Amino acid sequence: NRYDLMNDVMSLGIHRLWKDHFINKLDAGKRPNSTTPLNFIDVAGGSGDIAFGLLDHAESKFGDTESTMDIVDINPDMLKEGEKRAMEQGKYFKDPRVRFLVSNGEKLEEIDSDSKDIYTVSFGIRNFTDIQKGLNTAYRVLKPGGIFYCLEFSKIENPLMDFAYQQWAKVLPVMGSMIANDYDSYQYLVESIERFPDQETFKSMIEKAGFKSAGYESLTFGICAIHWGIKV
Amino acid sequence: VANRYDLMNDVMSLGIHRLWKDHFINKLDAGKRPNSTTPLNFIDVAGGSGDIAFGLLDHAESKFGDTESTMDIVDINPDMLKEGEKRAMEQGKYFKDPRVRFLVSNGEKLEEIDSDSKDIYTVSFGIRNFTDIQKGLNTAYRVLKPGGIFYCLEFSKIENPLMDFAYQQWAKVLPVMGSMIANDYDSYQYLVESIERFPDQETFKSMIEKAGFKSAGYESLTFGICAIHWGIKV
Ligand SMILES: C[S@@+](CC[C@H](N)C(=O)[O-])C[C@H]1O[C@@H](n2cnc3c(N)ncnc32)[C@H](O)[C@@H]1O
Numbered sequence: 238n239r240y241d242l243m244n245d246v247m248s249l250g251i252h253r254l255w256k257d258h259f260i261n262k263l264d265a266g267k268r269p270n271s272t273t274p275l276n277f278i279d280v281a282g283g284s285g286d287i288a289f290g291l292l293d294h295a296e297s298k299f300g301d302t303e304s305t306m307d308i309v310d311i312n313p314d315m316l317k318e319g320e321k322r323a324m325e326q327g328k329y330f331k332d333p334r335v336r337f338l339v340s341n342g343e344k345l346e347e348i349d350s351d352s353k354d355i356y357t358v359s360f361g362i363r364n365f366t367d368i369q370k371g372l373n374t375a376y377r378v379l380k381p382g383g384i385f386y387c388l389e390f391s392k393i394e395n396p397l398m399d400f401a402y403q404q405w406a407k408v409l410p411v412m413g414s415m416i417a418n419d420y421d422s423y424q425y426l427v428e429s430i431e432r433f434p435d436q437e438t439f440k441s442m443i444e445k446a447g448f449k450s451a452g453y454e455s456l457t458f459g460i461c462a463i464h465w466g467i468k469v
Numbered sequence: 470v471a472n473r474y475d476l477m478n479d480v481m482s483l484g485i486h487r488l489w490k491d492h493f494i495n496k497l498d499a500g501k502r503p504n505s506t507t508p509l510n511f512i513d514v515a516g517g518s519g520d521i522a523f524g525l526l527d528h529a530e531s532k533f534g535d536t537e538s539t540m541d542i543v544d545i546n547p548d549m550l551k552e553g554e555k556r557a558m559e560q561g562k563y564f565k566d567p568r569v570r571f572l573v574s575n576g577e578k579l580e581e582i583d584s585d586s587k588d589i590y591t592v593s594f595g596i597r598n599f600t601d602i603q604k605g606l607n608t609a610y611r612v613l614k615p616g617g618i619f620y621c622l623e624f625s626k627i628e629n630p631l632m633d634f635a636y637q638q639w640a641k642v643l644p645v646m647g648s649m650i651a652n653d654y655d656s657y658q659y660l661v662e663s664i665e666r667f668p669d670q671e672t673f674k675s676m677i678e679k680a681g682f683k684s685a686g687y688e689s690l691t692f693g694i695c696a697i698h699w700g701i702k703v
């Protein structure tokens with residue numbers, strides 16, 4: 238919930254709409270005239286907004302109740318909350334299709350090479366101590382024709398909006414400290430967005446990982462962005 | 470609609486509003502004691518979603534074993550009360566319960582609520598939206614029994630100058646991000662202005678005393694970003 242709250246606050250809840258757009262744009266899932274089940278992997282899943290979102294979208298639009306989902310997070314306490322959310326909604330709790338896994342996105346040692354059709358990472362890759370290694374691991378995990386999809390904060394192009402965002406980013410750790418004694422969380426959040434490579438640099442890092450037909454779509458003037466790539 | 474209100478609460482308090490509400494319920498400490506046989510009559514106003522209402526009944530059950538006290542959840546917005554009924558259904562508690570009623574009504578008048586029928590009156594972050602605050606306080610006095618308790622959780626005036634300074638920068642930038650990210654300057658500016666025009670701790674206390682309440686008082690929370698105000702009928 239700590240990350241849920243910071244995402245709610247930083248984006249004023251609009252991250253929900255970014256996630257809805259992200260899922261609809263990817264448009265992943267087993268088509269009705271096919272019996273091959275897709276193997277999803279959602280890295281840095283946390284409470285599971287994307288993982289459950291992908292599964293829900295695949296069912297309602299395609300009638301897919303076959304595809305498997307691996308939800309991966311480095312933090313066991315963050316993962317548990319995802320499974321805790323799964324029981325209360327009562328849909329993906331104790332489901333053979335859905336696996337919760339404690340693992341580092343830079344390694345993913347438990348995952349087999351060339352085993353996954355769809356890789357997603359949503360607002361998590363910026364927290365990786367090594368972003369490139371995580372991108373290389375993403376490539377390793379996917380099989381030919383596999384789609385990499387990333388939702389993450391980015392660079393705001395417009396100077397006025399960026400200037401307003403910087404002040405927002407300045408006042409957040411101050412307010413987080415005074416009200417919630419949470420300076421470190423908000424400062425690390427703000428600094429992780431600042432350090433993160435812009436739309437073009439990140440695209441190059443995705444290409445450097447080995448992905449082809451790589452591109453991006455800046456959302457809400459580039460406060461965040463959707464990056465993609467296809468294997469081979 | 471209720472999601473929108475939960476979001477603005479999270480954003481303005483940075484998620485701390487849940488700690489305010491838990492302190493609010495714990496401080497009130499309401500419920501039929503195990504040495505008593507008389508159930509209490511609760512009224513909750515301007516909280517159709519049920520955050521405080523469900524919390525009050527849960528607390529009374531947990532601490533005292535009180536599973537008999539009645540609760541009237543009152544909101545002017547029918548959409549908010551639908552969500553509360555949806556919450557109660559999905560919760561598996563307080564849905565289709567004779568103890569719990571969901572009622573459409575204006576908090577300034579509470580016409581469907583009889584005089585001297587309630588033991589506890591609670592309003593949480595809703596009274597600042599009342600077009601006339603005094604009318605709401607007078608009505609709260611009317612529905613309460615002798616010995617009835619008025620309890621209020623609402624945004625207030627910050628008493629810590631450094632917290633105030635930080636808040637003023639917050640209040641300026643927040644609606645700007647509202648306009649830029651959410652395409653919604655109005656809601657956030659309206660929220661900031663509704664907090665600004667609300668009476669301070671001493672003024673609101675006076676208004677509660679003008680309603681007729683005795684032994685009135687307040688406790689500032691988080692440097693006075695919000696406050697708990699109370700009053701006892703006779
Ligand atoms: C804001 S959340 C993202 C949750 C969810 N994907 C969303 O968009 O709301 C960040 C999550 O990434 C996880 N994380 C951070 N570093 C990681 C790493 N190296 N490998 C896997 N997960 C990581 C954190 O534990 C945290 O739960």
Ligand SMILES: C[S@@+](CC[C@H](N)C(=O)[O-])C[C@H]1O[C@@H](n2cnc3c(N)ncnc32)[C@H](O)[C@@H]1O
Pocket residue numbers: 474514515516517518519520521543544545546549574575576577592593594595598599600
């Ligand atoms: C932000 S919410 C309250 C937040 C949360 N549900 C709680 O009680 O802590 C404000 C609520 O007060 C209600 N409200 C506003 N003006 C009112 C009035 N004059 N009478 C009754 N309810 C009112 C609104 O419909 C809205 O649902």
